Amino acid sequence: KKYRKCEKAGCTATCPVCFASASERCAKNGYTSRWYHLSCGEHFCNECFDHYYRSHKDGYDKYTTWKKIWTSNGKTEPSPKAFMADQQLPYWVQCTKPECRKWRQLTKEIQLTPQIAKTYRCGMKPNTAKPETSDHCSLPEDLRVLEVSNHWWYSMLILPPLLKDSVAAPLLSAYYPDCVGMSPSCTSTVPGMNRYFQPFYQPNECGKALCVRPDVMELDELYEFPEYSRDPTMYLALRNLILALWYTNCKEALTPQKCIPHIIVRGLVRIRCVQEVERILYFMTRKGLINTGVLSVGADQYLLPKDYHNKSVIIIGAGPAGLAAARQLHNFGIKVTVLEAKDRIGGRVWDDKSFKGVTVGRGAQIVNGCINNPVALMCEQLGISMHKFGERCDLIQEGGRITDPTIDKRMDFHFNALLDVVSEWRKDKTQLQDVPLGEKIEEIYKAFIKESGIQFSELEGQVLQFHLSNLEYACGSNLHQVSARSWDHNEFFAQFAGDHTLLTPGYSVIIEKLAEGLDIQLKSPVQCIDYSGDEVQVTTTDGTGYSAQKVLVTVPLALLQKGAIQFNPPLSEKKMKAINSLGAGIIEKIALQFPYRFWDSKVQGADFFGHVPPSASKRGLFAVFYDMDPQKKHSVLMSVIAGEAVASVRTLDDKQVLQQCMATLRELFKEQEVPDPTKYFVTRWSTDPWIQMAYSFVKTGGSGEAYDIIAEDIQGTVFFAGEATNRHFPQTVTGAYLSGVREASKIAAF
């Protein structure tokens, strides 16, 4: 007949009141025949089914329009409840006066906007003006506000919230808005964003590194937010909003105050959204998914809430991983000091700046696959432009002849065919049955020649050696030390999509910015790490002590292998096994300046040219030459020494290497004259005491798991980062960077 209590058992509202006033005969406080429940604080009367029935007035027309729009654009059931929550419920804003921040209800006729939300204060009516007395900020908040903070409140919310006008929507066209936390009432009848930022997978998309499914929660997120196990849509909307905001301005720290005006949804529920967005924000900051890169955070205010646990970290080694970890922890507000052995930062990033017109890396200078790459993000932050490698790369023979591209492509096809047979071969072989990749390739080759009856020319044979020498460059070893089973172990995980680029200005630009304003001690080689006390005791070569609650080790694989730091307690037999299972690959580089760009008429502006080895024994000797000025004005070539070639250049001094390179170029350019170079460097990484390598690879008998094992923290106090520590992205500045962010994440939690 008529009731004064809600329809739902155990509902906490003693006196339901109708939030709509659609009906001529709306039961304001009194008895409807049925009180429909939206949430604990939100109810409407059976008369305000002015909307539902065909016979009833300025309801049915509005409702039916919404209903058609709802049905086609989204996949949620249309109902009067859904209508009320999408179309009718009042909005709630917080006061923007910083000292106040109180939640207030708006009168039904108001549509919330980011303009309103940025500027609202306790008092003001349908017009923006600050009131006069600032006394409205003293009034207590409507009692329903406090309830929304309890977890039982979300239990009693009959429909999940759907966000309006999410900055994330342009990026999410392929999805049903409601599947992704946004309102099917899409009125939006993205440019400017960096082409390299593609945060979201398009539906049913295969592995592309660092993409998030916008419609599914990852297990990491579930552990932290167990309440979204059944219905993740509220969580997903907020994370997606966060990602979209961060990538639309990655130059500034993303804060809750920045996020809130972009959260538009009617009802008391907006209060749970604004509370959750802050919790999600801190989670994603700690994980390094947001508020990261070369982001400098100012004096007083840091990226995570003040904790008072007095936690401190010593970080060993100031390369990319050390610096990534150091920067993150610092930004968090954790005390960090960095001990570095060398008289400079950067480790395997080292950029020569003395060549007029260019920066040439002694170490890293390329970015393989920019899409979602943090290196791309940091470039955007620093406003620097990378150069994308063109496809053209002619293979010049000794004598001057240019190898027809059809040979090139064919021998590459054959080389790959060989590698495919290896991946079939390995299918069932255990670790203990592994075989050098070099051995296996030859075997398969020798068989392939024997079965087919194919005869290759001398030149084809030589080009096949060129392609083999690239694999060796990639590994940093002659293939005879590389595992057939797990050489490309990491290619099972999603890899970095998009452009391969020359980081023209240098990785040093990113490195120096990461370091800026941190406590870095140079000329401080660590000799001993003692973690048996309440504090970690870190002792330097010349005897200086440093102490901290936690320590992070980022020293190169070559140096864990040699055990140059003494750990007490020792590292576990398991860990040593892992460490010794990986190889410390090596390449060297040479740079040459010339008085003019002698190669221009022959090379015609391509980023690089290749050098066909005259035999198997000369395989990695200046295999490739690089034009270090994509603007084609300055005169600097760069070349690499890989594989067996490294070993042969070991008895030669810098001048003798230079003479060998010159002789090599003059063969490649026989038909013409090549000038003497005027400035050069030859790189000696393998003998650089505190580095002794270029990048890790997996040796015969080894497993991609060794990276995971090296990364495992010890008693939650000794942590490991570094290139040889990142199973997904093994060799790169990128993987190094990400490993340092990974360990900071671990540390910041406890």
Ligand SMILES: Cc1cc2nc3c(=O)[nH]c(=O)nc-3n(C[C@H](O)[C@H](O)[C@H](O)COP(=O)(O)OP(=O)(O)OC[C@H]3O[C@@H](n4cnc5c(N)ncnc54)[C@H](O)[C@@H]3O)c2cc1C
């Ligand atoms: C010639 C060359 C070319 C390369 N090409 C590329 C490329 O094009 N693109 C790419 O992404 N990567 C490239 N790499 C690999 C990349 O440089 C590294 O993988 C990356 O720098 C990872 O380094 P890291 O973070 O482990 O720290 P690192 O750079 O390896 O070094 C960490 C620091 O540890 C310090 N240290 C060691 N022992 C101690 C100790 N006991 N106490 C204190 N400090 C210590 C070292 O001095 C060093 O400063 C190249 C490397 C080389 C050498």
Ligand SMILES: [K+]
């Ligand atoms: K009516």
Ligand SMILES: [Zn+2]
């Ligand atoms: Zn009513």
Ligand SMILES: [Zn+2]
């Ligand atoms: Zn109720």
Ligand SMILES: [Zn+2]
């Ligand atoms: Zn106020």
